[PDB]
Every structure is written in structure tokens, then in C-alpha cells.
């Protein structure tokens, strides 16, 4: 069997949107408040995360069907999935040799200890690193990686989602594409799809744990004041 | 004539509070989002200003009588005078040779053009530089400079001020101290006091113009998102 046009156009659109919103040179990191090794890494990681949110939004607006939803639904999907999309795109810089994220220079090489200095515990970081490694091992093609992100961001089962029917249809179509592609263009990817869908489940638990820890941080003004206006908006609960 | 104890203790308290909240090495500037020469200087100047607000608050809490006021009054005084206090403390780094503010390295040497890249017009910057130069020329002693800042921050004629009577008394006492000191310890300072009080009037106009221009900036989310949570709170109108 083979893939159809309006199915391959979807893959080309997503791949191009990812390239348009993911800087391989990481040349914007020098513009963030510098990293410093109470919670010394918060300023830098807050800027890193704020900047990633902007990228995720740019990516989302290019997912076919996303721009047609209501602003309320677009926001509901972004706010509830943003951290999961960030965690997925960060895998691109994850390294199985040092279990860290390397983004250009040694200054921008994040260890599990660095995130700790941003207010997080191993309760989150442990499962997170485990997730990164598991995903890194699936050796996804750029096409599957980008499809996984679009499928994640287009989940109708998120709090605040209104037009659950139209979003269910957009995500179903993205799922077919991923299934067809793995079956046709990924030699040895017999069990891949199920393992990918499994990764979305893992993300739900990480999202849940990240939200708790973030809530704790946002309730302490000496820490929340270190965050950016975009981070406070997206991770805030003032919907 | 000579100065009394509880009048000299006031001067020692203010001078010490200023030293405790004003870093002569400017070693914290490297922690701000780096300067970049639409509104390229906004990230850096927003961090500079956010950091100065924190210093002004630290200074205010050490002004005798300030910590006893109501939280509402302390906040009302801080929000309405913060920019004026920032402008006064920045004169310490102002240079009459280059009409710029020099804070350590060449990276942290601010020109009137830099502020322009933070969203401001000559409508403000012109009077501002003129103010800086006029004040720089008064060649104030550290004692008068610090007294001028405390007198400015303890002005009862600010919107939101409730206990206008107690604040009027705190500022009157600070004014006597400044008058006595100039008369007793400042050879040639016959006309100084009036020129200093004149500088507070000038600050009112700068504050007024700065507020307009800031309001314009805060209404555009692509710009307000570059600000910090503390700057948004202090310069915001959500009292």
C-alpha cells in the first residue's frame, strides 16, 4: 500500500512548520537571562520555556485545521498541552550518552540537576529523563516526531475544550497519517505506533506532575516574579 | 549653628541604606537579558528597571517611619514615585562628558538612543537628559542625594495616599535635615535647597510623561510580554 496526496501534504506541512519553528543553531539562547549554576536556574529556564511556548504557538497555527478552531479552543489546547509539546521538542537535543539536553554551547547543556535549581524535584525529573530516553530510543523519523507533536496538541480530551467533535476529527486524520507512514515508510516499525501512543500517555502523567510543582512555585511571589508574562499566562489557571 | 543627634542619625541611616542598596560594581547587570543594539533594548532595560525597583523597595523599607505606614500607603508611595527614584539613583552613573549612563562595561553604557529602542521618544528622553545634567551639576554630597530620594519617596501628594498627615510629617522632618545639612556642611550651598526642591518638580513632569509612554507600551501584548512581573505590577494601574 501507499500514501495519498491530502495525507502527504499534511506531512509536508507539519515537517515544514517544525523546521520554521525549531532553530537547530540555538542562537537565541544567548538572549535569555544567563544560566547560573535559592533556585538559581529559574531565570534562565523560565526564559527557555517562555521562548519554547512561542515556538509551539507558531507550530500550532500551522497544523492543518488548528487555525479554524475557535480562539477559546486554540487556547484551551495550547494551555493544557504546552508542556507536553515542549518535552517532545526537547528530545531533539537530548543525548543518551550524558542523559542531558545539549543546545549548542556548554553553557546551554542542561543536566537533571539544573532543572532542580528551577524548583523541580526528582518526582518529576526522574520520570522525565526516563521518558526522554524511551522516546530517544524509538529513533523516530522527523515525520513521525512532528506528527506525534501535532497529535498531542490536537487531543480533544483536555479541560476547557468545547468543539470536542471537530478536534476529535482533526486528530483522527493525523493519526491515520502517522499509522500509514509507519507502515509504509518505516522498515521495522511494526510495533512503533502503539509505542508512540503509549508515549502520549506517559506525557499526561508528566504534565500532571509538572502542573503540581509549577503551582507550588507560582504561589511564592519571590519565585513567580522570576517568570515571564507568557509563562504565567499559559501555565496559570486564570482561564 | 550645628545638627542634632536624632537628625544626624537620620542621615547616617539613609546613607547606609543607600550603600546597602546601590551596587557600585554593577555586577548584577550580567544577569539581565543581554542588551541588543522592533524595540531591541526593551528586554535589557526592563530587567534593569525591574532590578532597580527591588533596590528602591529595599531603600524605602529603611527610611525612618516608612515601615510603620500601612502596606497600602507604602505601596501607593512606591508605585507613584518608583520611576522618579530610579531617575535620581541613575544620576550616580550619569556622565556629563558623553551624556550617557555608564555602569561598568561598554555593554552597560546607555545612550539616549538605547532608551529609544525600549519604546520611548525624545519627548521624554530630552527632558530626562536635561534633568540628569542639571542635577549632575548640583554636585550633591552623598548625604543630600540620599535625602533627596527619601524626600521624593515620602511625598504625601501622590494618588492613593491615605494617611496624608503622617506622611507629611515624615517628609517635613526629612526636609529640615536636608536644609540644616546644606546650611551647615555645604560651603556655597546658599541656593542649593531651592534648586533641589525644584528638581522634585522636574521629576513630576518626567514621571507624567514616562507614565503616558509606558501605558502605550503596556497596551501592546507583544511588548508587555517582554516586561517583568514586578515592572507590570508597579507601573500597572490595577491598584
Amino acid at each position: 500500500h501507499m500514501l495519498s496526496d491530502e495525507q502527504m501534504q499534511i506531512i509536508n506541512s507539519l515537517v515544514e512548520a517544525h523546521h520554521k519553528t525549531y532553530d537547530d543553531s540555538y542562537s537565541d539562547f544567548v538572549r535569555f537571562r544567563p544560566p547560573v549554576r535559592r533556585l538559581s536556574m529559574l531565570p534562565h529556564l523560565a526564559d527557555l520555556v517562555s521562548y519554547s511556548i512561542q515556538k509551539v504557538i507558531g507550530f500550532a497555527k500551522m497544523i492543518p485545521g488548528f487555525r479554524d478552531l475557535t480562539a477559546e479552543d486554540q487556547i484551551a489546547l495550547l494551555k493544557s498541552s504546552a508542556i507536553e509539546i515542549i518535552m517532545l521538542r526537547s528530545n531533539q537535543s537530548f543525548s543518551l550518552e550524558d542523559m542531558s539536553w545539549s543546545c549548542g554551547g556548554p553553557d546551554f547543556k542542561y543536566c537533571i540537576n539544573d532543572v532542580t535549581k528551577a524548583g523541580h524535584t526528582l518526582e518529576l525529573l526522574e520520570p522525565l529523563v526516563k521518558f526522554q530516553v524511551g522516546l530517544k530510543k524509538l529513533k523516530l523519523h522527523e515525520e513521525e516526531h512532528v506528527l506525534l507533536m501535532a497529535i498531542c496538541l490536537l487531543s480533544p480530551d483536555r479541560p476547557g475544550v468545547q468543539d470536542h467533535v471537530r478536534i476529535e476529527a482533526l486528530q483522527d486524520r493525523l493519526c491515520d497519517v502517522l499509522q500509514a507512514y509507519i507502515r509504509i515508510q518505516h522498515p521495522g516499525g511494526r510495533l512503533l505506533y502503539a509505542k508512540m501512543i503509549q508515549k502520549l500517555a506517559d506525557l499526561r502523567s508528566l504534565n500532571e506532575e509538572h502542573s503540581k510543582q509549577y503551582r507550588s512555585l507560582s504561589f511564592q511571589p519571590e519565585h513567580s516574579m522570576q517568570l515571564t508574562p507568557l509563562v504565567l499566562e499559559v501555565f496559570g489557571s486564570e482561564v | 549653628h550645628m545638627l542634632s543627634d536624632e537628625q544626624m542619625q537620620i542621615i547616617n541611616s539613609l546613607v547606609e541604606a543607600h550603600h546597602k542598596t546601590y551596587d557600585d560594581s554593577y555586577s548584577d547587570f550580567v544577569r539581565f537579558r543581554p542588551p541588543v543594539r522592533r524595540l531591541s533594548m526593551l528586554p535589557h532595560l526592563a530587567d534593569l528597571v525591574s532590578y532597580s525597583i527591588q533596590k528602591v523597595i529595599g531603600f524605602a523599607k529603611m527610611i525612618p517611619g516608612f515601615r510603620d505606614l500601612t502596606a497600602e500607603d507604602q505601596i501607593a508611595l512606591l508605585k507613584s514615585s518608583a520611576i522618579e527614584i530610579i531617575m535620581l539613583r541613575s544620576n550616580q552613573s550619569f556622565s556629563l562628558e558623553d551624556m550617557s549612563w555608564s555602569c561598568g562595561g561598554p555593554d552597560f553604557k546607555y545612550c539616549i538612543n538605547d532608551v529609544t529602542k525600549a519604546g520611548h521618544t525624545l519627548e521624554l528622553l530630552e527632558p530626562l537628559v536635561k534633568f540628569q545634567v542639571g542635577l549632575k551639576k548640583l554636585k550633591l554630597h552623598e548625604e543630600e542625594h540620599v535625602l533627596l530620594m527619601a524626600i521624593c519617596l515620602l511625598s504625601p501628594d501622590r494618588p492613593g495616599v491615605q494617611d496624608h498627615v503622617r506622611i507629611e510629617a515624615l517628609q517635613d522632618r526629612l526636609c529640615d535635615v536636608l536644609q540644616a545639612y546644606i546650611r551647615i556642611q555645604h560651603p556655597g550651598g546658599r541656593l542649593l535647597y531651592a534648586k533641589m526642591i525644584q528638581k522634585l518638580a522636574d521629576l513630576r513632569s518626567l514621571n507624567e510623561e514616562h507614565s503616558k509612554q509606558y501605558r502605550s507600551l503596556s497596551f501592546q501584548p507583544e511588548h508587555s510580554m517582554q516586561l517583568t512581573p514586578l515592572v507590570l505590577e508597579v507601573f500597572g494601574s490595577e491598584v
Partner: peptide
Amino acid sequence: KHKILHRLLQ
């Protein structure tokens, strides 16, 4: 309010 997100979503 989400004014930043609205602006960014164009």
C-alpha cells in the same frame, strides 16, 4: 485574560 496568547495566535 490571555491577552498575550490571543495576540500571538494572530
